[PDB]
Amino acid sequence: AQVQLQQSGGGLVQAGGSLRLSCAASGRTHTPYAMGWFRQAPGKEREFVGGIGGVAATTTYADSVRGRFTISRDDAKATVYLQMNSLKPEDTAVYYCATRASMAVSTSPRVYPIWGQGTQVTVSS
Amino acid sequence: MAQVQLQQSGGGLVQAGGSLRLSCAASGRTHTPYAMGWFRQAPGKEREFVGGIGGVAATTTYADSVRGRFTISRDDAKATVYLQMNSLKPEDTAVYYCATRASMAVSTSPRVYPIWGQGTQVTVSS
Amino acid sequence: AQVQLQQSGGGLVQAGGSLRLSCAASGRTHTPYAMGWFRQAPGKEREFVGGIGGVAATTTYADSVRGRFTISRDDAKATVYLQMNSLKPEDTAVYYCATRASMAVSTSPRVYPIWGQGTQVTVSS
Amino acid sequence: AQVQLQQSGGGLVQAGGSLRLSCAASGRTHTPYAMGWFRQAPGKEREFVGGIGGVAATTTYADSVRGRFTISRDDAKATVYLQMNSLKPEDTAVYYCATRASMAVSTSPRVYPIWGQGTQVTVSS
Ligand SMILES: O=C(Nc1ccc(Cl)cc1)Nc1ccc(Cl)c(Cl)c1
Ligand SMILES: O=C(Nc1ccc(Cl)cc1)Nc1ccc(Cl)c(Cl)c1
Numbered sequence: 001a002q003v004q005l006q007q008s009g010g011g012l013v014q015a016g017g018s019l020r021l022s023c024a025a026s027g028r029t030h031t032p033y034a035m036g037w038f039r040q041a042p043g044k045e046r047e048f049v050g051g052i053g054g055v056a057a058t059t060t061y062a063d064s065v066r067g068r069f070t071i072s073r074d075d076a077k078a079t080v081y082l083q084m085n086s087l088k089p090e091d092t093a094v095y096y097c098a099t100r101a102s103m104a105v106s107t108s109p110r111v112y113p114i115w116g117q118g119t120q121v122t123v124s125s
Numbered sequence: 126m127a128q129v130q131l132q133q134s135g136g137g138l139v140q141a142g143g144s145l146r147l148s149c150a151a152s153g154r155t156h157t158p159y160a161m162g163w164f165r166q167a168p169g170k171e172r173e174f175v176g177g178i179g180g181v182a183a184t185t186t187y188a189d190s191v192r193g194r195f196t197i198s199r200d201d202a203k204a205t206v207y208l209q210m211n212s213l214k215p216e217d218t219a220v221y222y223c224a225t226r227a228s229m230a231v232s233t234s235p236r237v238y239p240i241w242g243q244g245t246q247v248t249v250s251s
Numbered sequence: 252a253q254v255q256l257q258q259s260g261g262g263l264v265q266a267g268g269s270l271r272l273s274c275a276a277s278g279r280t281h282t283p284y285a286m287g288w289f290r291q292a293p294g295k296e297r298e299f300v301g302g303i304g305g306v307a308a309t310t311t312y313a314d315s316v317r318g319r320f321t322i323s324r325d326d327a328k329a330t331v332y333l334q335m336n337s338l339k340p341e342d343t344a345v346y347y348c349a350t351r352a353s354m355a356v357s358t359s360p361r362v363y364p365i366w367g368q369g370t371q372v373t374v375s376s
Numbered sequence: 377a378q379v380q381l382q383q384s385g386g387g388l389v390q391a392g393g394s395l396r397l398s399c400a401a402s403g404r405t406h407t408p409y410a411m412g413w414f415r416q417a418p419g420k421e422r423e424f425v426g427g428i429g430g431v432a433a434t435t436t437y438a439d440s441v442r443g444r445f446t447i448s449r450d451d452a453k454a455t456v457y458l459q460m461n462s463l464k465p466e467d468t469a470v471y472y473c474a475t476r477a478s479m480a481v482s483t484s485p486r487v488y489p490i491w492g493q494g495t496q497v498t499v500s501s
């Protein structure tokens with residue numbers, strides 16, 4: 001692979017809690033390229049959460065996470081973050097970052113050829 | 126005695142085009158929907174608004190000169206607000222301050238914020 | 252009410268993670284005086300965690316936290332910090348700082364007349 | 377290439393004042409590896425100030441700073457701090473942090489391949 005994505009920072013929190021995930025990229029990195037966050041809960045397909053792309057770090061969000069989750073990036077560290085607030089039990093899933101050779105963010109996981117390892121996030125009621 | 130205390134971290138010297146993350150950790154009677162504003166001040170210059178975050182939905186606002194380069198976010202449970210800087214320029218050199226007030230509305234005037242961080246130096250070499 | 256201690260910095264940490272607590276002193280402060288750190292889990296008495304005192308900022312630690320926790324102090328801010336690393340569930344507890352009119356760090360809570368209000372630290376695994 | 381360190385927080389202080397420097401590590405970090413602090417005044421070569429290393433986080437100090445300066449570590453944030461107290465004008469210098477692929481602390485700058493950018497510190501009369 002041209003690029004390797006290493007994820008950090010999940011765990012188990014109570015409803016209303018916060019977590020921050022990181023996705024550190026190494027290899028032939030290019031920070032304007034799209035980084036997507038996707039999650040997969042038990043029994044479900046990979047659902048798009050949000051993405052970041054472009055020379056100006058523009059973000060886009062799924063309806064179910066807007067306002068609560070925030071995506072950012074540190075260019076010099078080649079790292080993209082997913083800040084999660086007001087967490088809900090329904091947010092429980094394995095979270096993945098993924099990237100592709102385009103600035104454009106897509107909702108389809110299938111157009112991202114490069115995947116991080118996944119991080120479990122679990123939210124108690 | 127203040128009702129809230131702001132403790133700033135991060136900063137330093139980087140090259141033009143570099144990146145930094147600044148942190149502003151709030152303690153005491155904290156209420157995370159209240160506005161947190163970032164201001165900067167370079168030696169011999171007036172204070173100026175950088176950007177801010179506020180509201181239940183974490184709405185952000187920025188000065189024109191930093192839009193597309195700086196991003197503000199918050200971590201409610203750590204009661205901490207971050208200012209992510211990318212594509213840094215010599216022009217961005219200054220002490221950076223966070224500030225807060227008992228209102229969700231982000232104001233661009235420093236006068237309306239009664240509570241201040243201690244500042245952190247950011248130097249961007251030419 | 253000769254010196255008062257305001258704590259900061261508690262909360263939920265994931266197993267293996269880190270947290271810094273703060274204890275700020277106000278009033279007729281003497282930074283060479285001993286600041287003790289103690290914790291209490293439900294169903295146990297306040298047990299000594301560690302402490303700092305003297306002009307040289309000498310420290311001492313309970314066996315179970317040595318290597319993992321560091322105490323330090325900032326004289327101009329009249330603040331003492333508890334840096335905690337490699338946190339595990341056994342560390343979950345309400346954590347207190349305390350002081351006394353003496354440079355000697357005592358392991359007994361009874362000889363400290365000044366207490367901070369305490370903060371909860373919860374670790375899940 | 378493998379780890380970067382970013383230093384924070386220089387500045388002016390009065391004699392008798394305190395200051396806290398940070399050294400944030402990023403990349404393929406290993407937190408028990410040795411991080412040394414050095415200082416250099418108007419061209420004199422970097423003299424050792426202190427270091428921290430090992431699983432149990434052991435600290436070592438130069439004679440000229442012991443007691444007054446303290447080093448600690450936050451493993452979660454891959455950051456090392458140097459807290460400075462009772463500062464005096466002879467402490468005026470550029471301070472650096474450095475790291476190496478070994479737990480062992482050494483007093484020689486040479487054996488640390490990785491260098492922070494340096495922070496100025498100035499202490500007045
Ligand atoms: O590098 C990246 N994305 C990326 C995005 C944000 C940050 Cl901070 C860092 C890296 N993508 C990339 C690079 C090369 C190829 Cl071939 C492909 Cl297919 C993708
Ligand atoms: O608490 C805050 N702001 C704040 C904003 C964001 C975060 Cl993550 C955390 C805290 N302000 C506040 C609170 C009380 C008073 Cl009196 C005043 Cl005057 C201001």
Ligand SMILES: O=C(Nc1ccc(Cl)cc1)Nc1ccc(Cl)c(Cl)c1
Pocket residue numbers: 253254276279280281282283284285286324325326328329330331350351352353364365
């Ligand atoms: O001041 C302190 N402790 C203290 C410790 C560390 C720092 Cl950084 C700052 C302050 N104790 C004190 C002071 C006065 C009295 Cl009467 C008594 Cl009874 C205790």
Ligand SMILES: O=C(Nc1ccc(Cl)cc1)Nc1ccc(Cl)c(Cl)c1
Pocket residue numbers: 378379401404405406407408409410411449450451453454455456475476477478489490
């Ligand atoms: O990681 C480190 N040091 C370090 C020290 C303190 C903390 Cl909190 C975190 C990290 N060194 C390192 C790591 C890799 C390489 Cl190749 C080299 Cl050459 C050095």
